[PDB]
Each structure stands twice: as structure tokens, then as C-alpha cells.
Design a protein around this ligand. Structure first.
Ligand SMILES: COc1ccc(C2=NN(C(C)C)C(=O)C2(C)C)cc1OCCCCOc1ccc(-c2nnn[nH]2)cc1
Ligand SMILES: [Mg+2]
Ligand SMILES: [Zn+2]
Length: 333
């Protein structure tokens, strides 16, 4: 990958972020973007700041300069789509920071594991084009065909891991370079395992496996740590409904537009479009959000909080608050 110029780093290093506490659960990335004309640089400074304030990169021999190089190499590989862009993964990074440090999930993991999660947040959607796995498979696209031939349904998640490995193979962006032996191996394996676990087709089984490990005092310890990392990355990924309503809404708008574009490309290729992806049916945002809350997010968050992540209670409270606020949009429509 072409290296990161002295210019690009300074461009990020000057953003001062007046008014913002990046470690806060009520932090607003939409307002951060809008507060300058160089949103990409602001996003990179949020990432950078979050990583330094954690104290983690320094402990694992990752200099300030290598960190920032990695962040900018990730940025370069995110596309200009509505939802799955660099803002999404900075969001996931920031959110996982809050689950670790304000939800006390750090108590369940080593420092190395916390560092790997924060890093993995930034790689976990590399080069997303705004189309899901399903699009690639049922259009018999080249990546679809390659995944089907190699016995793998997680079309995109495999692609994300490949690009992550490229970035890390350059020592000037290898945030794991200061590791050795089993620690370096664990960083790679856990990064890759987490990214593979974000495939939503695996949602139920990854959740069941996490809960089964947590309920069991004789669970293998390495496996529990691993499942917890996976569950946290997944939690960060479906975390939009745990945010202040206005933030949550703006996320739901961006996702909806992305799904609609896929539905338009499906239409053009003469393949099945799902209701949700269909721009014509215009199914209301609010019922969408309530449905997502009822069938996916509330059960997920309630079950992991109950099972062992007690400090993440606020997520369940904010989901309830948001559901009730969507009902008030319905009741007064
Ligand atoms: C901001 O709101 C959303 C954020 C993320 C998502 C996603 N859902 N999915 C699908 C595959 C489950 C994804 O891959 C991501 C993570 C992008 C959806 C969001 O809300 C959009 C609202 C559209 C309606 O959403 C649903 C989705 C699933 C169900 C359902 N019913 N039964 N089982 N699942 C209902 C509504
Ligand atoms: Mg993804
Ligand atoms: Zn994601």
C-alpha cells in the first residue's frame, strides 16, 4: 500500500475538536462531521484520540506515528457510500470504547484484547460498496462465485479480513509490530474471528454460543474471551439504536438509503428484491426501527447484559427509551 505522507498526518494532527468528549456515550459524530469542512480529518482524529487516551498502543510498542498511519490506511480503503463508510467504523470504534470503559467490559479482557477490538473496529468493513453478501451470491458476481466455490458464505467479511492483513503487512502501518510469539498470533486470530462474526447470517448462533459460554463456570477461558470480543464487535455494529434518538434516527436514514440503492441495483439485474430494500414501498422508518428493536436489538442487548455484561445496562434503557419515542411518533402521526 502507498505510504502515508508527512502532509496527511499533519492534516489530522491539527484538528482540535473543541467541545467534544469522545469517551462519552452521548458523543455525536454527526455533529462532529458538520463542525468543519474536513470531516474525514475530524473522523481520523477521533479514532486517533480514542486510541491514545486508552493507553493501549504505547503499552504494545505502537508509536503515535504508526497508529496514525494505520488509521489513514484504513480511511483510504473506505468508499463513499451512505452507511458503510469510514464514519460507520469510527462510530463502532468509539462505541466499543464506551462499552469497554463506561460499561466495564474491560474487566472481562486482557489489555491486548481491548487494543485488538479498538483496532478491529476500524478494519471490519474495509472496502464495503454498499451491497450485502446476498447481492453478490444471488447475482452470481465474481466474489459471489469465488465464495461459493471456496465453501464460504461470508463473502464480504473474508474480503474485509484480506484488506486488513494487507495494511498490517507494511511495518509503517502495523499496529501489531511490537508484539511477538503467541501475542502477535492472538491479535491476528482474534481480529479475524471478530470480523468473521459480524456476518448477520451468523447472528443467532454467535449469540447462543456467547450465552452458553457465559452461563458455564467451566467454560474454556480462551474461548470465553474470544466470544466476548466477538460479541462486543457485534454489539458495536448494531449499536445505532442504543444512541440518543436523534443520532439513532440519522443512522437509520443512512442505512435505509443504502438498502434502497441495493434494491435499485437488484431491480436492474432482474433478481429478487426484498421489501426492506424496495424504494417504492417506502415502509416507514419508525415501524422499521421498532421492528429492529423488537426482533434483533432489544433481545440481544438484554440477553448479554443479563448473562454477564451488567455495566452495559444503559444500552437496554436507551433502546426502551427509543422504542417508546418511536411509539410517540406513531401515536401522534
Ligand atoms: C439504524 O438502524 C439499523 C441499523 C442496522 C441495521 C442492520 N440490520 N441488518 C439486517 C441484515 C438484520 C444489517 O445487516 C444491519 C446491521 C445493517 C438495520 C437498521 O434498521 C433499519 C430498519 C429496517 C428494518 O429492520 C429490520 C431488520 C430485521 C427485522 C427482523 N424481523 N425478524 N427478524 N429480524 C426487522 C426489521
Ligand atoms: Mg460488515
Ligand atoms: Zn459494520
Amino acid at each position: 500500500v502507498t505510504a502515508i505522507t508527512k502532509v496527511e498526518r499533519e492534516a489530522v494532527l491539527v484538528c482540535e475538536l473543541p467541545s467534544f468528549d469522545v469517551t462519552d456515550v452521548e458523543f455525536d459524530l454527526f455533529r462532529a462531521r458538520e463542525s468543519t469542512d474536513k470531516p474525514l480529518d475530524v473522523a481520523a482524529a477521533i479514532a486517533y484520540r480514542l486510541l491514545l487516551g486508552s493507553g493501549l498502543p504505547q503499552k504494545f510498542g505502537c508509536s503515535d506515528e504508526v497508529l496514525l498511519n494505520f488509521i489513514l490506511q484504513c480511511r483510504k480503503k473506505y468508499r463513499n457510500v451512505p452507511y458503510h463508510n469510514f464514519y460507520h467504523v469510527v462510530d463502532v470504534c468509539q462505541t466499543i470504547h464506551t462499552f469497554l470503559y463506561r460499561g466495564n467490559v474491560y474487566e472481562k479482557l486482557t489489555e491486548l484484547e481491548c487494543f485488538v477490538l479498538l483496532i478491529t473496529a476500524l478494519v471490519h468493513d474495509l472496502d464495503h460498496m454498499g451491497l450485502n453478501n446476498s447481492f453478490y451470491l444471488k447475482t452470481e458476481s465474481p466474489l459471489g462465485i469465488l465464495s461459493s466455490a471456496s465453501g464460504n458464505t461470508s463473502v464480504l467479511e473474508v474480503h474485509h479480513c484480506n484488506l486488513a492483513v494487507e495494511i498490517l503487512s507494511d511495518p509503517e502501518s502495523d499496529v501489531f509490530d511490537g508484539l511477538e510469539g503467541a501475542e502477535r498470533t492472538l491479535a491476528f486470530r482474534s481480529m479475524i474471528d471478530c470480523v468473521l462474526a459480524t456476518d448477520m447470517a451468523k447472528h443467532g448462533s454467535a449469540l447462543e454460543a456467547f450465552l452458553a459460554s457465559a452461563a458455564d463456570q467451566s467454560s474454556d477461558e480462551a474461548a470465553f474471551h474470544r466470544m466476548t470480543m466477538e460479541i462486543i464487535l457485534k454489539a458495536g455494529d448494531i449499536s445505532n439504536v442504543t444512541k440518543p434518538f436523534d443520532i439513532s434516527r440519522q443512522w437509520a436514514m443512512a442505512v435505509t438509503e443504502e438498502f434502497y440503492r441495493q434494491g435499485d441495483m437488484e431491480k436492474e439485474r432482474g433478481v429478487e428484491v426484498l421489501p426492506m430494500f424496495d424504494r417504492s414501498k417506502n415502509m416507514e422508518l419508525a415501524k422499521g426501527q421498532i421492528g429492529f428493536i423488537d426482533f434483533v436489538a432489544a433481545p440481544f442487548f438484554q440477553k448479554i447484559v443479563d448473562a454477564c455484561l451488567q455495566g452495559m445496562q444503559w444500552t437496554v434503557d436507551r433502546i426502551k427509551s427509543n422504542r417508546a419515542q418511536w411509539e410517540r411518533v406513531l401515536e401522534t402521526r
